[PDB]
DNA sequence: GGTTTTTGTCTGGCTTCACACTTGATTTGCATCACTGTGTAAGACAGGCCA
DNA sequence: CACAGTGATGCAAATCAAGTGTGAAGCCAGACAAAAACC
């Protein structure tokens, strides 16, 4: 009973959210990083600085489409350092 | 209290623990365990921590991070590990990540006993004829007593087998998961108990030279279970049905026997306690629990798995070359080349019965020749009741064969050279041989087969044999002949032909009616008299098989390899414990239970 | 009938994952390869009884 | 003959890894009454 009791009073009480205790008593009573992932880290600030709000989606979304326009030589070469580094790990 | 050690966490607690103990000794009889099981699966929900809650759960179910018992056992016996191998396996992952992800010997034991028969209570009502009540019978002497001692008959077999019912019943437990899952597929309620009834392909082999290094060969005897109906109001409903019937995988072994399938003294006493147990089992409902409720089973046996020679052997008929040369019928060889197609199914086990009485009572005082041709071949008397089918491998094979002889006779025009030798012969084929590898790259072998039969049966190779063939209006009839066997191949290559094809199915006697009469009339060169038990069953029986069975191709080579497998690998070297130890491994190996963990990545 | 239980009802503000999107270099999944030994049964072949 | 079953192979498809802001999903509390079995 209790779920049609409330939802009739939905308009009985105009706008109220009624509490529990009364209301009761009411019914009751009725790895490296790759390049371009070393890229993206670093860049990150530049593209929130200059677009604070854009998503995940957006922010990554970008970053992916200018930095395949594009120079990025420097990160590969980061990328075979880290990678050789890691692989000494054992 | 975490960074703790035990003594610590247990004086720390102590206080809470005396209160905890008091509290659970008070209030559920001492049950500890349940209470802190559901207060810390209920504090972990209170957290949101659902993840760890349900781990937890899991954990208890036995689903994550340490396998069931009987997914170990589904490994070990489905991968031929042994007890030491798989131990090994065991103690060192065990070692190396410190958790017990495979679980110890005893356990699979244990989980081994629940899949074995014998362990399911049930009944027999009327209790069966001759066949002991008690339900805790597992592996038994396949010998059922055979007297041994050195006066009697010389025992030179080992075999081990199971009751006969109390096998059934592990099989259908075994399915139990499959059989409730169908029933709510077809729209009806898990507890219904309404009698189900249980068809059961009925199946028997030797498996030749069994040895490892004197050859040692074994008889297979087996059951599969083919469909499961239900009785909702006066429709039968099927709520299983096995997908693979020919599968080695669903192929429950019964006995395994050390012996000669043509050995027939030894053979009828391992086999013959079995039958007994079956024929009992003809008239008697099983009542098994399934789920909590009591379901009634009744069972239908058809002994459709023999091949020509093991039900010639057991139905009391002459051996192979015989002049009676089909098992459904009284024919000979010369009548069912005469008489192409107008053949029907006549034998039964009875009548082989009193065949076989009359053979022995020679009633009418007559010759050997009158009285065998009296029994139409029973001279022996029968002891299994067979269903005799047909493989669609011999379909094929029978008809590549005929079609085969009848290029070469084309080629080398047979009709306008009735006394031509050997050697003129020999060259026809040759020409064949040779015109069919240049044209469609066949390999003449000299041994009939499916592949080639599959590459020959084609209307171009008709077209590519004619390229051979003078006369234009021949090639007319072998087209035509061509055309009449691609209509009739379907019916017996398909697994159910009244879906998959109608209308050839209707057709199929008049095709095979065309086809008689167009060997009869334009190639009466290929009649002489003979003709094979495949060729003379495909042009006369098919409809009725698939009439009484349904399918031809529903209705075992791996076997001697499975065999030899089990017993090298994972079997005591001891006479005493080998077979024993083959025969139990063999049927965990055919558990749809274990089965279901093995395909889990689908 | 009284005396005991199960299982709901109404909120929100909480906590804990899954998804969202990209890039490309790893990692998995899966079917396939080439290949002979072995079982099986299709089909040569040895054989002895009686005319 | 077919075919079983070996270790290697090769290509397609997940997968990983980072950023974090969502949305979805389940749970909390307290007075209490339905739908239910126990004397
Ligand atoms: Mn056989
Ligand atoms: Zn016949």
Redesign the pocket.
Same mark, same amino acid.
């Given at each position: &009973?209790?779920?049609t009791c +409330?939802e009739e009073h939905k308009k009985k009480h105009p706008d109220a959210?009624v509490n &529990?205790?009364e209301?009761?008593?009411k019914?009751?009573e009725r +790895?490296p990083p790759?390049a371009?992932?070393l890229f993206c880290?670093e860049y +990150?600030p530049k593209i929130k600085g200059e677009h604070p709000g854009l998503?995940?989606?957006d922010?990554?979304?970008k970053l992916?489409?200018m930095?395949?326009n594009t120079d990025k030589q420097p990160y590969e070469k980061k990328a075979a350092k880290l990678?050789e580094k890691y692989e000494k790990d054992i | 209290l975490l960074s703790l050690t035990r003594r610590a966490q247990k004086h720390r607690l102590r206080e809470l623990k005396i209160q905890v103990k008091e509290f659970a000794d008070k209030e559920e009889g001492g049950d500890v365990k349940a209470v802190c099981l559901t207060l810390f699966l209920?504090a972990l929900?209170?957290? !949101?921590?659902?993840?760890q809650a349900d781990e937890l759960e899991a954990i208890m179910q036995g689903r994550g991070s340490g396998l069931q018992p009987a997914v170990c056992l589904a490994i070990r016996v489905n991968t031929f590990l042994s007890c030491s191998q798989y131990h090994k396996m065991y103690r060192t992952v065990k070692a190396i990540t410190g958790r017990q992800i495979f679980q110890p010997l005893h356990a699979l034991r244990n989980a081994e006993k629940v899949l074995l028969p014998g362990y399911h209570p049930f009944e027999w009502q009327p209790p069966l004829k001759n066949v002991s009540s008690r339900t805790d019978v597992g592996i038994i002497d396949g010998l059922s007593g055979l007297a041994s001692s050195v006066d009697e008959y010389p025992v030179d077999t080992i075999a081990k087998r199971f009751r006969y019912d109390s096998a059934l019943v592990s099989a259908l437990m075994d399915m139990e998961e499959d059989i409730l899952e169908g029933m709510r597929s077809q729209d009806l309620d898990d507890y219904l108990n309404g009698p189900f009834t249980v068809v059961v392909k009925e199946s028997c082999d030797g498996?030749?030279?069994v040895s490892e290094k004197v050859p040692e060969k074994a008889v297979r005897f087996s059951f599969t279970v083919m469909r499961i109906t239900i009785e909702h109001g006066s429709q039968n409903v099927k709520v299983f049905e096995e997908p693979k019937p020919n599968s080695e995988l669903c192929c429950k072994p019964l006995c395994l026997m050390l012996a000669d399938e043509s050995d027939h003294e030894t053979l009828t006493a391992i086999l013959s306690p079995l039958i007994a147990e079956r024929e009992a089992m003809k008239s008697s409902e099983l009542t098994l629990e399934m789920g909590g409720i009591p379901r009634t089973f009744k069972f239908i046996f058809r002994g459709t798995g023999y091949?020509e020679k093991l039900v010639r052997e057991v139905e009391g008929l002459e051996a192979s070359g015989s002049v009676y040369i089909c098992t459904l019928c009284d024919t000979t060889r010369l009548e069912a080349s005469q008489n192409l197609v107008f053949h029907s199914i006549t034998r039964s086990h009875a009548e082989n019965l009193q065949r076989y009485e009359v053979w022995r009572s020679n009633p009418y005082h007559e010759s050997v020749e009158e009285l065998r041709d009296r029994v139409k071949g029973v001279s022996a008397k029968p002891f299994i009741e067979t269903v005799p089918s047909i493989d669609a491998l011999?379909c094929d094979?029978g008809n590549a064969?005929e079609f085969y002889k009848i290029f070469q006779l084309e080629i080398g025009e047979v009709y306008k050279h009735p006394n031509a030798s050997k050697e003129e012969r020999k060259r026809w084929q040759a020409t064949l041989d040779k015109h069919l590898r240049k044209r469609m790259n066949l #390999?003449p072998?000299?041994?009939? !087969?499916?592949?080639?039969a599959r590459k020959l049966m084609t209307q171009e190779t008709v077209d590519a044999v004619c390229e051979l063939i003078p006369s234009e209006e021949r090639h007319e009839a072998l087209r035509e002949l061509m055309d009449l066997y691609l209509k009739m191949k379907p019916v017996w290559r398909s697994s159910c032909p009244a879906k998959e094809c109608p209308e050839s199915l209707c057709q199929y006697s008049f095709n095979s009616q065309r086809f008689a009469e167009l060997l009869s009339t334009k190639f009466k060169y290929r009649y002489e008299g003979k003709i094979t038990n495949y060729f003379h069953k495909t042009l006369a029986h098919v409809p009725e098989i698939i009439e009484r069975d349904g399918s031809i191709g529903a209705w075992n080579?791996?076997? !001697? #390899?499975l065999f030899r497998?089990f017993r090298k690998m994972n079997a005591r070297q001891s006479k005493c414990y080998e077979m024993e130890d083959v025969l139990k491994h063999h049927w965990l190996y055919t558990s749809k239970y274990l089965q279901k963990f093995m395909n889990a990545?689908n």
């Amino acid at each position: &009973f209790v779920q049609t009791c +409330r939802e009739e009073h939905k308009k009985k009480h105009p706008d109220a959210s009624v509490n &529990f205790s009364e209301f009761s008593k009411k019914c009751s009573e009725r +790895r490296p990083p790759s390049a371009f992932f070393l890229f993206c880290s670093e860049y +990150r600030p530049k593209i929130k600085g200059e677009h604070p709000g854009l998503s995940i989606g957006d922010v990554a979304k970008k970053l992916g489409e200018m930095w395949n326009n594009t120079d990025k030589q420097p990160y590969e070469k980061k990328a075979a350092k880290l990678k050789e580094k890691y692989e000494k790990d054992i | 209290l975490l960074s703790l050690t035990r003594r610590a966490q247990k004086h720390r607690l102590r206080e809470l623990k005396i209160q905890v103990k008091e509290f659970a000794d008070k209030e559920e009889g001492g049950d500890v365990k349940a209470v802190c099981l559901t207060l810390f699966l209920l504090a972990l929900r209170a957290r !949101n921590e659902h993840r760890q809650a349900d781990e937890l759960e899991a954990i208890m179910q036995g689903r994550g991070s340490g396998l069931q018992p009987a997914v170990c056992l589904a490994i070990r016996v489905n991968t031929f590990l042994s007890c030491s191998q798989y131990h090994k396996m065991y103690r060192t992952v065990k070692a190396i990540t410190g958790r017990q992800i495979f679980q110890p010997l005893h356990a699979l034991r244990n989980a081994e006993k629940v899949l074995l028969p014998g362990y399911h209570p049930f009944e027999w009502q009327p209790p069966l004829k001759n066949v002991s009540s008690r339900t805790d019978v597992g592996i038994i002497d396949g010998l059922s007593g055979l007297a041994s001692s050195v006066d009697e008959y010389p025992v030179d077999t080992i075999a081990k087998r199971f009751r006969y019912d109390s096998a059934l019943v592990s099989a259908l437990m075994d399915m139990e998961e499959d059989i409730l899952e169908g029933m709510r597929s077809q729209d009806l309620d898990d507890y219904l108990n309404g009698p189900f009834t249980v068809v059961v392909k009925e199946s028997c082999d030797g498996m030749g030279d069994v040895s490892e290094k004197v050859p040692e060969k074994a008889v297979r005897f087996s059951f599969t279970v083919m469909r499961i109906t239900i009785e909702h109001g006066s429709q039968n409903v099927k709520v299983f049905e096995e997908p693979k019937p020919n599968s080695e995988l669903c192929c429950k072994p019964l006995c395994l026997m050390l012996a000669d399938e043509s050995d027939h003294e030894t053979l009828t006493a391992i086999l013959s306690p079995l039958i007994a147990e079956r024929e009992a089992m003809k008239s008697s409902e099983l009542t098994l629990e399934m789920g909590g409720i009591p379901r009634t089973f009744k069972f239908i046996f058809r002994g459709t798995g023999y091949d020509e020679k093991l039900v010639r052997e057991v139905e009391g008929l002459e051996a192979s070359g015989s002049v009676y040369i089909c098992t459904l019928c009284d024919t000979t060889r010369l009548e069912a080349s005469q008489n192409l197609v107008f053949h029907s199914i006549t034998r039964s086990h009875a009548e082989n019965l009193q065949r076989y009485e009359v053979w022995r009572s020679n009633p009418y005082h007559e010759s050997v020749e009158e009285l065998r041709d009296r029994v139409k071949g029973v001279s022996a008397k029968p002891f299994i009741e067979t269903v005799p089918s047909i493989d669609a491998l011999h379909c094929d094979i029978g008809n590549a064969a005929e079609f085969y002889k009848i290029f070469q006779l084309e080629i080398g025009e047979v009709y306008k050279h009735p006394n031509a030798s050997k050697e003129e012969r020999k060259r026809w084929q040759a020409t064949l041989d040779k015109h069919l590898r240049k044209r469609m790259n066949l #390999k003449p072998i000299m041994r009939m !087969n499916g592949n080639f039969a599959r590459k020959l049966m084609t209307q171009e190779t008709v077209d590519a044999v004619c390229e051979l063939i003078p006369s234009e209006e021949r090639h007319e009839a072998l087209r035509e002949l061509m055309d009449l066997y691609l209509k009739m191949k379907p019916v017996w290559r398909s697994s159910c032909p009244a879906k998959e094809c109608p209308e050839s199915l209707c057709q199929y006697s008049f095709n095979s009616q065309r086809f008689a009469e167009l060997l009869s009339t334009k190639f009466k060169y290929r009649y002489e008299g003979k003709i094979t038990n495949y060729f003379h069953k495909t042009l006369a029986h098919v409809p009725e098989i698939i009439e009484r069975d349904g399918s031809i191709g529903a209705w075992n080579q791996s076997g !001697n #390899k499975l065999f030899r497998r089990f017993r090298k690998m994972n079997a005591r070297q001891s006479k005493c414990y080998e077979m024993e130890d083959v025969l139990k491994h063999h049927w965990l190996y055919t558990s749809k239970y274990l089965q279901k963990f093995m395909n889990a990545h689908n």
